[PDB]
Amino acid sequence: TTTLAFKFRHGVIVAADSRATAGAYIASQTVKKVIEINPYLLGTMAGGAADCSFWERLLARQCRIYELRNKERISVAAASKLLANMVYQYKGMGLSMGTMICGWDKRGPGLYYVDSEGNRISGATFSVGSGSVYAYGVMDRGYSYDLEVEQAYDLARRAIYQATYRDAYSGGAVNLYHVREDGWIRVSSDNVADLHEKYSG
């Protein structure tokens, strides 16, 4: 895996690869690792595939029920806290799962990192997965809060790309989403083979 997300002036950028492995064997390269919880809430996905999918889906259910009950939309902090609380009750049982809850809140752009270990921290930028370090490199070397939209897109896409270059367990296609105040938008979905041609020559 190799997901990453950072918040700047114009919302929250979210990006991921799509590779899924079963050992050294590449089981898939067409995995949607950015779960669409709500039209304003996204959840990245890294680690145990079934674990992430199931728990974030359940999170989506819970957020929907919250929306119906309280006649208002759930906050990013509340969603992340919900997921964290659900996951914590299974601590030590072997759930492998590291996700990012991103969205736009009444407090503006929101981004949280939530672990199967029990972590839950808000922050500006985050990178999760086997290739997270490689992404962290370029992302940190190119990040700014005053980044223009297309620039942020380039930064995220490139970071995930370099990550796929070094990390043997990351590849497939770079997917890119943008979270704005009126909801999120599916920015891009470029295959790595094409991005190679674009970035090298």
């Binding site: 079963a22 064997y25 898939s28 067409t30 949607k32 079934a50 674990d51 999918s53 199931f54």
Partner: protein, 213 residues
């Protein structure tokens, strides 16, 4: 001590066409270095529009099969309609994850038709992680089947080739070919190949023969 698992072999394949869906599997049930039976297809007809392939540990295969049957019936009694293919996929996901801490040792591939009549494959992992595919292999010889279909159906690594959609005929011969090749290298794959074709007309069953060694 005591192990509640035993690998029984078996290979499984599903291809999705524009108006069809193929679900095929070998018919060899084995254990250790021995053959249990040569007449054991891994294909299970769920509905007129949906066929399931289950490989791995035979106990969990049987159990999961019967469970899926029962729950199909339940859904039918509850909503007065048959389960759509994608619905069966989601249900299967939940059922598989329900044993997250004592998994069914089963590789599952669902092949059928969606609500628009088009073909669809859904590939699963033993604990419920699934996705929709045009074509996927699973089971012992999976790594032998996948790369060819990536080349021939996905047209990958081929320069200036035409993207002609897969016809039922070509798909059929492709299935027979990959299974025949797998029978050469995989020791768990052999005896016979059962193929299940799913169209608007219904479900056909064909049976090619594989080597017995």
């Amino acid at each position: 001590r005591f192990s509640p698992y035993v690998f029984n072999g078996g290979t499984i394949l599903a291809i999705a066409g524009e108006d069809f869906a193929i679900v095929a599997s070998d018919t060899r049930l084995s254990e250790g270095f021995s053959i249990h039976t040569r007449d054991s297809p891994k294909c299970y007809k769920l509905t007129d529009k949906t066929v399931i392939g289950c490989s791995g540990f035979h106990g969990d295969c049987l159990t999961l099969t019967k469970i899926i049957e029962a729950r199909l019936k339940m859904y039918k009694h509850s909503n007065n309609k048959a389960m759509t293919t994608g619905a069966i996929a989601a249900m299967l996901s939940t059922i598989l994850y329900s044993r997250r801490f004592f998994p069914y040792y089963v590789y599952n591939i669902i092949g059928g038709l969606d609500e628009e009549g088009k073909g669809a494959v859904y590939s699963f992992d033993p604990v419920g992680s699934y996705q929709r595919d045009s074509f996927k292999a699973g089971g012992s010889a999976s790594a032998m089947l996948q790369p060819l279909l990536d080349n021939q159906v996905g047209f990958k690594n081929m320069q200036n080739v035409e993207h002609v959609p897969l016809s039922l005929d070509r798909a059929m011969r492709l299935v027979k070919d990959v299974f025949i090749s797998a029978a050469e290298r995989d020791v768990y794959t052999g005896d016979a190949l059962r193929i299940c074709i799913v169209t608007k007309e219904g479900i056909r069953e064909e049976t090619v023969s594989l080597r017995k060694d």
